[PDB]
Write an enzyme that holds these catalytic residues in place. Structure first.
Site, PDB file in Angstrom:
ATOM      1  N   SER A  43       0.793  -1.227   0.000  1.00 42.65           N
ATOM      2  CA  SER A  43       0.000   0.000   0.000  1.00 42.65           C
ATOM      3  C   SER A  43       0.828   1.282   0.000  1.00 42.65           C
ATOM      4  CB  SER A  43      -0.972   0.005   1.190  1.00 42.65           C
ATOM      5  OG  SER A  43      -2.029  -0.933   1.008  1.00 42.65           O
ATOM      6  N   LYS A  46       0.218   3.825  -2.774  1.00 40.07           N
ATOM      7  CA  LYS A  46      -0.921   4.733  -2.802  1.00 40.07           C
ATOM      8  C   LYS A  46      -0.466   6.186  -2.797  1.00 40.07           C
ATOM      9  CE  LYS A  46      -4.111   1.455  -0.659  1.00 40.07           C
ATOM     10  NZ  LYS A  46      -4.220   0.806   0.669  1.00 40.07           N
ATOM     11  N   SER A 103      -5.691   3.625   4.326  1.00 39.46           N
ATOM     12  CA  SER A 103      -5.260   2.560   3.417  1.00 39.46           C
ATOM     13  C   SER A 103      -6.451   1.807   2.820  1.00 39.46           C
ATOM     14  CB  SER A 103      -4.293   1.601   4.113  1.00 39.46           C
ATOM     15  OG  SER A 103      -3.231   1.248   3.244  1.00 39.46           O
ATOM     16  N   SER A 210       1.403  -3.398   3.933  1.00 40.79           N
ATOM     17  CA  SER A 210       1.605  -4.766   4.383  1.00 40.79           C
ATOM     18  C   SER A 210       0.970  -5.714   3.378  1.00 40.79           C
ATOM     19  CB  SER A 210       1.038  -4.993   5.792  1.00 40.79           C
ATOM     20  OG  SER A 210      -0.368  -5.118   5.766  1.00 40.79           O
TER      21      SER A 210
HETATM   22  C1  LIG Z   1      -1.785  -2.275   1.353  1.00 39.12           C
HETATM   23  O1  LIG Z   1      -0.754  -2.433   1.950  1.00 39.12           O
HETATM   24  C2  LIG Z   1      -3.080  -2.888   1.845  1.00 39.12           C
HETATM   25  N1  LIG Z   1      -2.812  -4.226   2.280  1.00 39.12           N
HETATM   26  C3  LIG Z   1      -3.722  -5.342   1.976  1.00 39.12           C
HETATM   27  O2  LIG Z   1      -4.741  -5.165   1.360  1.00 39.12           O
HETATM   28  C4  LIG Z   1      -3.345  -6.776   2.476  1.00 39.12           C
HETATM   29  N2  LIG Z   1      -3.952  -7.746   1.595  1.00 39.12           N
HETATM   30  C5  LIG Z   1      -3.863  -6.956   3.866  1.00 39.12           C
HETATM   31  C6  LIG Z   1      -2.992  -7.315   4.875  1.00 39.12           C
HETATM   32  C7  LIG Z   1      -3.460  -7.485   6.159  1.00 39.12           C
HETATM   33  C8  LIG Z   1      -4.809  -7.290   6.436  1.00 39.12           C
HETATM   34  C9  LIG Z   1      -5.686  -6.927   5.419  1.00 39.12           C
HETATM   35  C10 LIG Z   1      -5.219  -6.759   4.138  1.00 39.12           C
HETATM   36  C11 LIG Z   1      -3.703  -1.997   3.009  1.00 39.12           C
HETATM   37  N3  LIG Z   1      -2.654  -1.261   3.676  1.00 39.12           N
HETATM   38  C12 LIG Z   1      -2.207  -2.261   5.055  1.00 39.12           C
HETATM   39  C13 LIG Z   1      -1.422  -1.513   5.937  1.00 39.12           C
HETATM   40  O3  LIG Z   1      -1.270  -0.264   5.744  1.00 39.12           O
HETATM   41  O4  LIG Z   1      -0.856  -2.068   6.908  1.00 39.12           O
HETATM   42  C14 LIG Z   1      -3.448  -2.651   5.605  1.00 39.12           C
HETATM   43  C15 LIG Z   1      -3.319  -3.957   6.446  1.00 39.12           C
HETATM   44  C16 LIG Z   1      -4.075  -1.561   6.462  1.00 39.12           C
HETATM   45  S1  LIG Z   1      -4.418  -2.914   4.209  1.00 39.12           S
END
Ligand SMILES: *C(=O)[C@@H](NC(=O)[C@H](N)c1ccccc1)[C@@H]1N[C@@H](C(=O)O)C(C)(C)S1
Length: 260
Positions: A43, A46, A103, A210
């Site tokens: 992320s 972004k 996010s 993450s």
């Molecule tokens: C980008 O990093 C996004 N990550 C995800 O969509 C992962 N598939 C995910 C990991 C864990 C839990 C849910 C989804 C978003 N940005 C992350 C972050 O900033 O730590 C997030 C977990 C908030 S989701």
């Protein structure tokens, strides 16, 4: 050096692969650890999508006020803000804020659609001099973080240089720059990451990331009081596909960096 010995020891203690890039704007000096290796951005990409829309708004003065429908089919794995406006609309400003500060993956996909696809995001990176950043997929599949996969990767060196030009440099307009800085300062996901390793007196704007393989990322611009700003990128990934997040590693890397 010395910071590199401690960062190497931190990485050894973690079981994973750490990437760090620091830019001290006082003398334009850099501290890097695996700064030219590719890491999954997750992320943290972004920031590039929000900055690319901001660059469009330099020509389209009312772009951030443009409403965008949120439909049930737009909903993906993690949507804290867009879940609240389903069958309603959200402006591009509120989607950029949802993407950067919470996010929201649906908000990110709306930024990508506004740029004409992931290639529109990569195009903006190249237009400001980032030859390493590449975005290939929408959310959430951009978080697969497969070892060796070049898709949706960058290096810590390139990300640190790009984040500096966006938030400190003049890659954006002045109104656009200040709006991005304000957005990053209001991030809500980064309390346990880079922020946890820095002196409390320091103001921080950051974006976390993450994904799978225990990928745990954070990119930040730091304003120490009475001191020229800093840019810090910390990327971390692990060998196990189901590995847990290690936000504590990013705090430790930041603490090691802040000490020296
Ligand atoms: C980008 O990093 C996004 N990550 C995800 O969509 C992962 N598939 C995910 C990991 C864990 C839990 C849910 C989804 C978003 N940005 C992350 C972050 O900033 O730590 C997030 C977990 C908030 S989701």
């Amino acid at each position: 050096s010395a910071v590199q010995q401690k960062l190497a020891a931190l990485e050894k203690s973690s079981g994973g692969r750490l990437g760090v890039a620091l830019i001290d704007t006082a003398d334009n000096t850099q501290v890097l650890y695996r700064g030219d290796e590719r890491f999954p951005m997750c992320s943290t990409s972004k920031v590039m999508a929000a900055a690319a829309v901001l660059k469009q708004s330099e020509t389209q003065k009312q772009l951030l006020n443009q409403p965008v429908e949120i439909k049930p089919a737009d909903l993906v794995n993690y949507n804290p803000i867009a879940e609240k406006h389903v069958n309603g609309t959200m402006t591009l400003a509120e989607l950029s804020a949802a993407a950067l500060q919470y996010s929201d993956n649906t908000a990110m996909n709306k930024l990508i659609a506004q740029l004409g696809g992931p290639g529109g995001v990569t195009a903006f990176a190249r237009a400001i001099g980032d030859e390493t950043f590449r975005l290939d997929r929408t959310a959430p599949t951009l978080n697969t973080a497969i070892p060796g996969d070049p898709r949706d990767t960058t290096t810590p060196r390139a990300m640190a240089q790009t984040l500096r030009q966006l938030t400190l440099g003049h890659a954006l307009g002045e109104t656009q720059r200040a709006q991005l800085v304000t957005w990053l300062k209001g991030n809500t996901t980064g309390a346990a990451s880079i922020r946890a390793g820095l002196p409390t007196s320091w103001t921080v704007g950051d974006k976390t990331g993450s994904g799978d393989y225990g990928t745990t990322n954070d990119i930040a611009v730091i304003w120490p009081q009475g001191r020229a700003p800093l840019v810090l990128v910390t990327y971390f990934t692990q060998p196990q596909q189901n590995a847990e997040s290690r936000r504590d590693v990013l705090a430790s890397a930041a603490r090691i960096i802040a000490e020296g």
